């Protein structure tokens, strides 16, 4: 910035493009050479895309050139960490964590089932044989 004066004071990049905020010429009043001016200007003029606080759910925002990166807490994903991993427990997602059969229910949690000859353990996803020779196991290795 430039008050009645201020400018009386010679070129600083301090107390002139940074304690305040400068135009492209206050920037070559200073650098003189222009690869040099462009180089400064690219990053200076870009601005903090993280100012809009796009990262949700406790994520941290790292500024880039004309973009950003959200770092997410473990239970989250998405560009803006918008996705709760815990709400994705549906049968199309790795079979719901079911070992055998998965059943989707609107209104409620997915329930796991087992093939004839197995029954479901207490953990709610694992199946165990209720007969001696169940389908689809190879006895000489079990």
């Amino acid at each position: 910035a430039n008050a009645f004066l201020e400018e009386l004071r010679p070129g600083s990049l301090e107390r002139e493009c940074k304690e305040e905020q400068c135009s492209f010429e206050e920037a070559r009043e200073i650098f003189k050479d222009a690869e040099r001016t462009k180089l400064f200007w690219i990053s200076y003029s870009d601005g903090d895309q993280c100012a809009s606080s796009p990262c949700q759910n406790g994520g941290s925002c790292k500024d880039q050139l004309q973009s950003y990166i959200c770092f997410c807490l473990p239970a989250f994903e998405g560009r803006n960490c918008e996705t709760h991993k815990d709400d994705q427990l549906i049968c199309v997602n790795e079979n719901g964590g079911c070992e055998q059969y998965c059943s989707d229910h609107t209104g409620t949690k997915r329930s796991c089932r087992c093939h004839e000859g197995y029954s479901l353990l207490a953990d709610g996803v694992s199946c165990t044989p209720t007969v001696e020779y169940p389908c689809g196991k190879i006895p000489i290795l079990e």
Binding site: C91, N95, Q100, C102, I138
Partner: protein
């Protein structure tokens, strides 16, 4: 099977061998004590519906050991929609006259539910196919059960990636591709009716049946398998149905 390995005795225990008057006909897959799944095309030229045996616990065709069980096939059930000399709807359901006895050497492959198969089994890349069929396209058949790991393709990728050819049948929604390919590669003549088996979280399921290919390993070509998932309801309904009096039976599909 071309380019496969021996299946160590006992480690393909749901493989079935079908014979007609002592001659090797096709493979099959045991799904419980009295029911076997095979390929429709295996029966196109039979006319001795009582010279038709299933053998379970087979390994080496050249020695008989105590693990082999034989059974007479009581009934062969195919779709009404199947047409001899074509490739579509290539599936057969076989009732054994008496049950097999389940042993360390004789175990069924699980028939899965339709949705589990379509939504989960379909996206497991590698499945096993097995048989006593030709070791080479030319060449001879195997004495010891052979087995191979093949990767599954979606049909769109199978078309866009198979080498184009004047008179190859269409891949239908009742089929899926193997194999890749690249020649090493695949399954072959004499393996027909045999299983394509998929592992998932500790259990094995029938996902396919050896059906046809344009010859073997199939270069620029893939193996084609019956898409079992399409026939599950039809298999279950017939497995609870009342035995008709003839051997061969055309049941409506769907």
């Amino acid at each position: 099977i071309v380019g496969g390995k021996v299946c160590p005795k006992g480690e393909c225990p749901w493989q079935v061998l079908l014979l007609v008057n002592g001659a090797q006909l096709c493979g099959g897959t045991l799904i419980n004590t009295i029911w076997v799944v095979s390929a429709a095309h295996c029966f196109d030229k039979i006319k001795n519906w009582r010279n038709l045996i299933a053998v379970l616990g087979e390994h080496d065709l050249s020695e008989h050991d105590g693990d082999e069980q034989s059974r007479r096939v009581a009934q062969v059930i195919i779709p009404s929609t199947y047409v001899p000399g074509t490739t579509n709807h290539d599936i057969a359901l076989l009732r054994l006259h008496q049950p097999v006895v389940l042993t360390d050497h004789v175990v069924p492959l699980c028939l899965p539910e339709r949705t589990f198969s379509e939504r989960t089994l379909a996206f497991v890349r590698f499945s096993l196919v097995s048989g006593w069929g030709q070791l080479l396209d030319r060449g001879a058949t195997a004495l010891e059960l052979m087995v191979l790991n093949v990767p599954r393709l979606m049909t769109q990728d199978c078309l866009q990636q198979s080498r184009k050819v004047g008179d190859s049948p269409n891949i239908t929604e009742y089929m899926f591709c193997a194999g890749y390919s690249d020649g090493s590669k695949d399954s072959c003549k004499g393996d027909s009716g045999g299983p394509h088996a998929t592992h998932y979280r500790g259990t094995w399921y029938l996902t396919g049946i050896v059906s046809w290919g344009q010859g073997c390993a199939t270069v620029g070509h893939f193996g084609v398998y019956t898409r079992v998932s399409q026939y599950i309801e039809w298999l279950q309904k017939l497995m609870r149905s009342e035995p008709r009096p003839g051997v061969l039976l055309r049941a409506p599909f769907p």
